[PDB]
Design an enzyme around this catalytic site. Sequence first.
Site, short mmCIF file in Angstrom:
data_model
loop_
_atom_site.label_atom_id
_atom_site.label_comp_id
_atom_site.label_asym_id
_atom_site.label_seq_id
_atom_site.Cartn_x
_atom_site.Cartn_y
_atom_site.Cartn_z
N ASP B 25 0.87 -1.17 0.00
CA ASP B 25 0.00 0.00 0.00
C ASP B 25 0.90 1.22 0.00
O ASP B 25 1.34 1.71 1.05
CB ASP B 25 -0.93 -0.03 1.21
N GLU B 118 0.21 2.83 13.26
CA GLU B 118 -0.74 2.62 12.17
C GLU B 118 -1.80 1.68 12.73
O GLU B 118 -1.69 0.46 12.62
CB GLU B 118 -0.04 2.08 10.93
N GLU B 127 -11.56 -3.53 14.70
CA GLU B 127 -10.58 -4.28 15.48
C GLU B 127 -10.05 -3.50 16.68
O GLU B 127 -9.37 -4.09 17.53
CB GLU B 127 -9.40 -4.80 14.63
N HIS B 276 -5.18 -0.10 0.44
CA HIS B 276 -5.61 -1.47 0.71
C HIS B 276 -6.92 -1.51 1.49
O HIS B 276 -7.60 -2.54 1.48
CB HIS B 276 -4.51 -2.23 1.46
N1 LIG Z 1 -1.95 -4.21 21.54
C1 LIG Z 1 -0.86 -4.39 20.65
N2 LIG Z 1 0.40 -4.49 21.12
C2 LIG Z 1 1.43 -4.66 20.28
N3 LIG Z 1 1.26 -4.74 18.95
C3 LIG Z 1 0.03 -4.64 18.43
C4 LIG Z 1 -1.07 -4.47 19.28
N4 LIG Z 1 -2.17 -4.40 18.50
C5 LIG Z 1 -1.81 -4.53 17.22
N5 LIG Z 1 -0.48 -4.69 17.19
C6 LIG Z 1 0.34 -4.85 15.99
O1 LIG Z 1 0.30 -3.69 15.23
C7 LIG Z 1 0.44 -4.05 13.89
C8 LIG Z 1 -0.60 -3.37 13.11
S1 LIG Z 1 -0.35 -3.23 11.32
C9 LIG Z 1 0.94 -2.07 10.98
C10 LIG Z 1 2.38 -2.60 10.93
C11 LIG Z 1 3.49 -1.64 10.70
N6 LIG Z 1 3.52 -0.61 11.70
C12 LIG Z 1 3.32 -0.99 9.33
O2 LIG Z 1 2.86 0.18 9.24
O3 LIG Z 1 3.63 -1.64 8.30
C13 LIG Z 1 0.32 -5.53 13.82
O4 LIG Z 1 1.60 -6.11 13.58
C14 LIG Z 1 -0.16 -5.92 15.09
O5 LIG Z 1 0.36 -7.18 15.50
#
Ligand SMILES: Nc1ncnc2c1ncn2[C@@H]1O[C@H](CSCC[C@H](N)C(=O)O)[C@@H](O)[C@H]1O
Lengths: 337, 337
Positions: B25, B118, B127, B276
């Site tokens: 994306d 993000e 979510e 995306h």
């Molecule tokens: N409570 C939490 N503690 C730690 N990581 C978390 C979380 N909730 C979601 N995540 C993580 O946050 C990520 C969200 S997606 C974004 C991934 C990366 N920052 C990027 O921009 O490419 C996922 O890997 C998910 O596992």
Amino acid sequence: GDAWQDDEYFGNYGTLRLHLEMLSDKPRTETYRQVILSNSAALREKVVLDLGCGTGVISLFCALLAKPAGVYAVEASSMAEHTEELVKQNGCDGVVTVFQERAENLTLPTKVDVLVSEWMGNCLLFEYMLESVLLARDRWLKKGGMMWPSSACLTIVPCQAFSDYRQKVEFWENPYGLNFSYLQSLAQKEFLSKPKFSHHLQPEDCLSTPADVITLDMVTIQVSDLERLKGEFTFTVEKSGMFHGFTVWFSAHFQCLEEDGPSIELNTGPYSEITHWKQTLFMLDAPVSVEEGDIIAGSIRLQRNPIWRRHLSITFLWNINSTEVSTVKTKCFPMWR
Amino acid sequence: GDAWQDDEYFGNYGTLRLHLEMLSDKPRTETYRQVILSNSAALREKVVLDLGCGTGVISLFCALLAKPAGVYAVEASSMAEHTEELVKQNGCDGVVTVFQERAENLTLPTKVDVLVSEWMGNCLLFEYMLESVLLARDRWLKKGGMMWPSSACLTIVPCQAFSDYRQKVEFWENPYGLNFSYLQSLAQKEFLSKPKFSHHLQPEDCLSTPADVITLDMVTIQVSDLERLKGEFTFTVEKSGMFHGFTVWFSAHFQCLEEDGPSIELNTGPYSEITHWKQTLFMLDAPVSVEEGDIIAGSIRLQRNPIWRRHLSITFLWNINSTEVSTVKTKCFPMWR
Ligand SMILES: Nc1ncnc2c1ncn2[C@@H]1O[C@H](CSCC[C@H](N)C(=O)O)[C@@H](O)[C@H]1O
Ligand SMILES: Nc1ncnc2c1ncn2[C@@H]1O[C@H](CSCC[C@H](N)C(=O)O)[C@@H](O)[C@H]1O
Ligand SMILES: [Cl-]
Ligand SMILES: [Cl-]
Ligand code: NA
Ligand code: NA
Ligand code: NA
Ligand code: NA
């Protein structure tokens, strides 16, 4: 039962989602419509078994486009309750009888002259509804009766797949200038070890002329023949390019009820109108460049899963410009979505 | 835990499939890259928390495109083990520290000046990773610190959706000449009662100018504010057409660390480069024709599911050229894939 995952399999066919996909597939559905039309006169007073009728569309083609003595519409999922109402609302309840039964535990009033079914899965065999079809054939099809489709074949071609390999494997080398090449090993296992369903192979990505590797004769094939299906192949590369893997599809053939008649074919390959099956792509671990005149020879094996009976593994064996055995490569793809 | 479906949620983020989607994306990932670039000088000697770093890409943007005193890359899924190696292979292990921890049970060496994440899901809230972000903010963000994104908003528009309604509902009236209209009731429940993710809204299908209905201030919003989010709207229809439903998307805003600085926006709507997330479509039970000048007014409510804490329901209330209450229509969409 549990080994057949019947709860999930027939549960999926109880919703409209899969039937909308089948009925929106015009090449698929119109083919069965054309088979009925091309054999309309020969179907008069015949008894037809529509095995796995879904919404009943094929049965309705038989009752509305011909004059059979009777049509047995058999469907094991909950859709059968609606099929019964659809038959009645299309004015066919005097000819079409709906049976909410599995083919394996089926009780029909008479034997049948014609057994028509749409049983083909991905790479022809996936989900092995063909087994159910053969069991109903052995019990209910009269000697000399017709199977529709009467034959089917599996077709493969060596192919290029640049977009898939670049987007899934080479992508990691420098996304946004970062070195993520450490993830390429994991990418090869996650993205390249499994078949890619719904692949749209373009004609210019074929490296040779496609070849039929396995052919099934629907009158003589037995359930025991389905445990292991094998076919040999040898391809002469017709244009220089990149050998990324193999693309697989199938064809189904519908013999006319009369010798002097038109035979009808359903082709799911790249030179035909796209179907909901599309084609299936099997990526090599690493691509190899090839030139015109190169020979890619080997075999393909469809090995039924001994435990999960709707699944199989597809094993490719191939050799490039060589006959020795130390040069042979092999890759086994588990057929799961 | 179980109410959060954390096994499945973090299990999905342990594979490359979802990260390939995020990194492919370009509008999404380049936006975060541009935020770091636009604030490069202001980030010097700052401590940055990258909450939910995934592969660590945002942390690597911070360490490579600026000179922070330290970057805390926090990731709860198994991807963190690979993120640690990726950080080291990009020469950032002296600045970036990887913590394989959940935000809820997080232990950091120091508080932070900037919390970048993000976290946005479909329709912004899906979510509810935002909850995790707010809990880490309350514990670890220094007073006066920066949240990135600093604000977000939910945007909706009344829209046409001919292809969806024809392919899924009207399709059944006469497929191949058969009367399958008896299935239309089931089609309305199966295909129209749920949101359609990954909808690509075309500009010509907008019936009015889109409006922001809910706005979140990332510094002042509290976890308790997320149980029920509501916004009013009133649309003047600008072109005569068919009112099939509402399309929803979001925007995220990144305030510059310095007052005199550039503010950067990530927009997932139809007038921006596709992401995306695409857009999300909410179909009415039955379409209604509208003319230029018609007023579509009402409200939208995002009600968190009390049991399954990553899910919610979205309720639309609307009225066409009317103020009375006996004319009001309502439809509640459960947010499940
Ligand atoms: N409570 C939490 N503690 C730690 N990581 C978390 C979380 N909730 C979601 N995540 C993580 O946050 C990520 C969200 S997606 C974004 C991934 C990366 N920052 C990027 O921009 O490419 C996922 O890997 C998910 O596992
Ligand atoms: N062993 C079995 N007994 C009865 N029905 C079966 C079956 N195996 C598969 N089916 C049914 O066969 C259908 C296959 S899909 C094709 C549906 C319909 N004939 C059409 O062409 O549109 C499914 O509805 C499935 O439930
Ligand atoms: Cl970079
Ligand atoms: Cl017809
Ligand atoms: Na029935
Ligand atoms: Na052929
Ligand atoms: Na780690
Ligand atoms: Na806005």
